[PDB]
Amino acid sequence: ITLKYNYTVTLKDDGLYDGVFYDHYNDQLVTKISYNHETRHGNVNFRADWFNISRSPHTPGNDYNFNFWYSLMKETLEEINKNDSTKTTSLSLITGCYETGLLFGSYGYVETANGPLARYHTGDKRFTKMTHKGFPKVGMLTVKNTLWKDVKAYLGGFEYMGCSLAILDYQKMAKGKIPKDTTPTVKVTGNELEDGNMTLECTVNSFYPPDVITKWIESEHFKGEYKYVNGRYYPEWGRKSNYEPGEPGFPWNIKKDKDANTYSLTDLVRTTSKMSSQPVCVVFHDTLEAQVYTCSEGC
Amino acid sequence: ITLKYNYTVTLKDDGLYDGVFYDHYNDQLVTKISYNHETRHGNVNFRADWFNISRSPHTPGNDYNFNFWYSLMKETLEEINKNDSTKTTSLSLITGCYETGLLFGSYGYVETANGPLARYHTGDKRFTKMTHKGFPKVGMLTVKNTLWKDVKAYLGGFEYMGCSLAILDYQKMAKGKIPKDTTPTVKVTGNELEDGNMTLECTVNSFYPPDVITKWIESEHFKGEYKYVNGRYYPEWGRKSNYEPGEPGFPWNIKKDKDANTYSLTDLVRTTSKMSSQPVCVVFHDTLEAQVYTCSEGC
Amino acid sequence: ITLKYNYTVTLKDDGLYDGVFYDHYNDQLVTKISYNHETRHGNVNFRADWFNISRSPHTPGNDYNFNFWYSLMKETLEEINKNDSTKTTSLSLITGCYETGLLFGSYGYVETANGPLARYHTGDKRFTKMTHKGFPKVGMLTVKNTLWKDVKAYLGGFEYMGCSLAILDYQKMAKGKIPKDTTPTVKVTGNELEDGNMTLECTVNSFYPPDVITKWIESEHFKGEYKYVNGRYYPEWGRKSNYEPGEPGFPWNIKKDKDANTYSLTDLVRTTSKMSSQPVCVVFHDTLEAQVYTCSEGC
Amino acid sequence: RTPSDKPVAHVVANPQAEGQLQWLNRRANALLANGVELRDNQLVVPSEGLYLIYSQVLFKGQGCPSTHVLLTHTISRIAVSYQTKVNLLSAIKSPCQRETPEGAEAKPWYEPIYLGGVFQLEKGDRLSAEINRPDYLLFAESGQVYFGIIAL
Amino acid sequence: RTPSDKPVAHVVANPQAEGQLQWLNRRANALLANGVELRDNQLVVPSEGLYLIYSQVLFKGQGCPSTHVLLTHTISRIAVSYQTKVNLLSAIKSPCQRETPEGAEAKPWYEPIYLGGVFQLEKGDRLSAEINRPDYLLFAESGQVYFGIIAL
Amino acid sequence: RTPSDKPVAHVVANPQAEGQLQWLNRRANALLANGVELRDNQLVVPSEGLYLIYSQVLFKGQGCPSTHVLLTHTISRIAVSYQTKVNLLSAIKSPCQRETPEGAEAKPWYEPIYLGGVFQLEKGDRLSAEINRPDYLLFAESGQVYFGIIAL
Ligand SMILES: *[C@@H]1O[C@H](CO)[C@@H](O)[C@H](O)[C@H]1NC(C)=O
Ligand SMILES: *[C@@H]1O[C@H](CO)[C@@H](O)[C@H](O)[C@H]1NC(C)=O
Ligand SMILES: *[C@@H]1O[C@H](CO)[C@@H](O)[C@H](O)[C@H]1NC(C)=O
Ligand SMILES: *[C@@H]1O[C@H](CO)[C@@H](O)[C@H](O)[C@H]1NC(C)=O
Ligand SMILES: *[C@@H]1O[C@H](CO)[C@@H](O)[C@H](O)[C@H]1NC(C)=O
Ligand SMILES: *[C@@H]1O[C@H](CO)[C@@H](O)[C@H](O)[C@H]1NC(C)=O
Ligand SMILES: *[C@@H]1O[C@H](CO)[C@@H](O)[C@H](O)[C@H]1NC(C)=O
Ligand SMILES: *[C@@H]1O[C@H](CO)[C@@H](O)[C@H](O)[C@H]1NC(C)=O
Ligand SMILES: *[C@@H]1O[C@H](CO)[C@@H](O)[C@H](O)[C@H]1NC(C)=O
């Protein structure tokens, strides 16, 4: 399952700054809020019929602190645009959590129309660069800001525990009103992209909760038994991206397959000779907490 | 609340050695016992109507082991009088405990008509000098004594835990039959005794349970919030006395105010320049577990 | 109480290898199994009427894994006989446990017609020499063996905990159907074997559960009170034998006394001058968890 | 004597505060040392770490009330990084199964509840041990109502 | 932040698995660290040592069944050197004393059970926290059903 | 294998001693090591320190007695510096709410009680885990009745 909050202010054409907020449970829209220019505050434009916000104590109040964020983000966007080498169309606050099979975590980062900017770390209680480029310490991004204390509380708190608690209330109220869980079909293929030696392709077919995570682990680590043991440690051949798996910004080749509620995924891996066991594909999804899949050459 | 036991043998005029024992709960006499010269053992002369000794399992038996103490103290007094440089009129065994607001503790020491002699330490299981002068290792004061084992048990035991348990039984039976709790009025004044720079005076007005303790702490230690946190550590500007606060022998300027059951206190402090924050007065009493009070110059 | 399992394969006269198994609770035969040469598997020849094997979940299944052991022991005996300097008539697997008074433990060792061979240690999960001579690493005695995993499981498991749990089920079903507990009479005598200075003799008279253990401890260690404190440490003047007390192979001078169900014991000790307190005899038996007995010279 | 150096606390219920559940550490065999504070009736952790948290309450009632009565005991954590009571341990118990005194007799009833577990705590966290029916709190004996934590 | 370095685990019951008792560690204030694994619904110890093991289940039932119902909670150890469930801690509780709803009413009942003790464990041991009537499992609230261990 | 070095003990009830509650350490998963002694049916602490003390008893009764029956479980400390039983932990439970078998039937009842907390102890202190109705002691299963302590 997944819970994602998206706050976005845009410079739009010429003039005002627009603001929108989206609350998504899995791929289901739960709430939409936009900044009303006439009134000067947000308005709920959409609310899923199955979500009784009163039964979700951990969903932020004041319409998700929209006015607070819109305003502070507007401020941040203005400052960001002063150094003409940063000027951007819009700014987004991406925060939420997930329970993908055995895996689970939360996130909170700020991205720009130009790409990821800064990630908020619950431990250090501050933002950290997501790119070598760094990020401008302005607006909601610096401790210098007078409202920093609110940022820590609203963003940090939600990411620290609020979200993980809330996601469970959504699940309860969603039980019957959304696509049913659907177990995928997995197959790992050992093709070969010509120039390089070998290539492994893990493909997961039509699974419902759209969140899926994949881990490539050298088979030696399974000491003969191909089961992923929960608390056990495993070295894992990390992927290269500015995003960390779990954050909606992570590049997963997922497409909603043909007329249906289900989704499909294809994950490729460069079997460079650096290794020494040939990875096996470990798939994390709601159905099948965590299964291991093998074979190359083409299985 | 307070529980105090006082055993005293005196050489009286010329002759015999008199013996008395007093049991005081707060300022309420609970039991009086005196040595009967005709019979050669103690007799209960007084017993508070509200105290059913059968409901106080932790109050020492055998009329508070009176015969034992009278005899052993008589022996100790005789030995003490042999070295003519110690000769004293009487000897007293002061033991008891207290629950003054947040503070709590127990004591057991021996004093002479000439002043404090030795204090019994639960840890070391032996007596320790209360004055530079030292104390004669005779009678009930040395491990050499054949009855030492009984001293350890009767005095050490009571001080180690017996008293703290008993005091609670007294409280139960006293509930309705004694002066009601009365909260004091506090004011700290910053007078100045001429020769010295500054002087602070903490005055607590008309409080019932007569036990009150005061702590002077530099304001810096309260980091802006003037509340005394229970388990927190605080350096405290100790007072100078042979007695430790809590022992009835500690000098507190308390007087039972005008025709009433209540009491009043006045504590002064030499604001020498040694410090660096100007102390604040912390008052420990049954009413208001522990409150902080400030201001000087005269408030 | 005692639970002993004895597996034995013998070369008999000329030809085949015979196999027998005995299950003894105290001195009571519970089960007898022997290898049927016609059928080629074991047969239960005897079963105590009071033992319902279904009520003893921890008694090994498959008739105590008899076929397994018979076969593996037969293999081991054959290998042992190849080095003509080891050639033996038979091989035995002795395993079981005990609850003799306060003492308790388990054992599992392999002995030969020539004497103790190897002892199995639950900790190291391997066999260890019981004699300076060492033992041939063949058959069921080496990790090299293809069935080692079964040895660890059947023998190691039983010794690790299986037995201690099972013995309690036997006790329940035996309660009324075997000799009642009988407390012994003890007397320690201080005779003297002429050449040596002094000799101590602890004699325990007619006790029922036949298991009895004796410990000789210098009296100094009892600091005046002659009671053996359960969890307390005591240096103990060990005896010299290839067997450890508790193993049925330990030399105890026990004889079933005259027409009765009870037994008697006589333990002697060389009071060499090495000591410095003269040992006292501590007797461990079901009746009297652990009692101390003194005096020499002849008491 | 070094209690140990480990932050620890074992507070007990104040019998002199009828009708409510107030914790104190100024008694016989109670504890409040090495940093943990008792503030606003809650224990406050002094450092990051794994903690064993536990509590026991003893409910007592004379005869039976009306309809149905529920007794709840629960230990909450209000984290420094998320100021909100979140339950760590909780239990419920139904004393009077609606029996309700027929009209003659009605003996007293006792119902204890124990709670305990290990948790990752932040320096500054506040722990609460609360009940819903303090009017049934039996703190007459001594070691019947307690709340404590020890840093493992 | 170092949870501590000590193998530890505090797993809680999955509410999304009606009818059964499945343990998870992917929640709010739960733990599964420093080596202990959650395999086949059992905690697996990573090293020799003394461990504090504990568990709590909360049973709930609407009105009363027939004859008599028994609730059991028990923690078993299946040792590496003796692959067989052997009970370490166990308790029994009788909710409906045969009362059985006369025919009008029948309120709900709650019955909690706590288990805990210290044990010597081998690297590889498997610990189980099971119940006999998972159909009465009340895991609606939160800290009502848990199972954990901490290496002391 | 080093149990750990920490004084510890987990004793269990002897089933072969009907009518009474006698603790033993000579069983399956029990402990009595590193100094603590089991003397006169009490655990004796070998050193100054903070200790986790705990115990569980399981009461069982066939049908119901007369008037009212009270079950109490309590752990006492008799300190070296104050030789007298003082209660550290205690609980009470009322099984038969006077129901008393009408005259036909009367099923059995089970009632468990857990006790546990952390305490400062002196070398030489004696700890007792006692009950008032040993005639209702159900020590038939195994891990149903235990008493232990571990030095933290
Ligand atoms: C947030 O919403 C904006 C506009 O609705 C969209 O363009 C953007 O991709 C979203 N961000 C994420 C990562 O969901
Ligand atoms: C959610 O909506 C329902 C109506 O369907 C209402 O009765 C309820 O009070 C709301 N929230 C809750 C459960 O408190
Ligand atoms: C922001 O603009 C300043 C000029 O004021 C420039 O020096 C700086 O490098 C810009 N930010 C970065 C590091 O790209
Ligand atoms: C003890 O009692 C004696 C005699 O009544 C008295 O003179 C002495 O001051 C008392 N000491 C204390 C501290 O109560
Ligand atoms: C205290 O006095 C009462 C009479 O008021 C007596 O019955 C009782 O035995 C004594 N102590 C108690 C309450 O046992
Ligand atoms: C006690 O008397 C002796 C004389 O025998 C004297 O030397 C001693 O100093 C006296 N006590 C003290 C130390 O004041
Ligand atoms: C085991 O059984 C054999 C054969 O019956 C017997 O001779 C031997 O003494 C027994 N060994 C032990 C230790 O009981
Ligand atoms: C043991 O034998 C009894 C009768 O002797 C039989 O009824 C029982 O089922 C067997 N074991 C048990 C108690 O299951
Ligand atoms: C086993 O036989 C070998 C020669 O075959 C001999 O050297 C050895 O000493 C024998 N076993 C032992 C070590 O006693």
UniProtKB/Swiss-Prot annotation, chains D, E, F:
Coiled coil, from the record: none
Extracellular side: 1-152
Subcellular location: Secreted
Start and end residues of each THD domain: 7-152
Cystine bridges: C64-C96
Name of this chain's protein: Tumor necrosis factor, soluble form
Organism classification: Eukaryota, Metazoa, Chordata, Craniata, Vertebrata
Gene designation: TNF
Boundaries of the shown chain within the full protein: 82 to 233 of 233
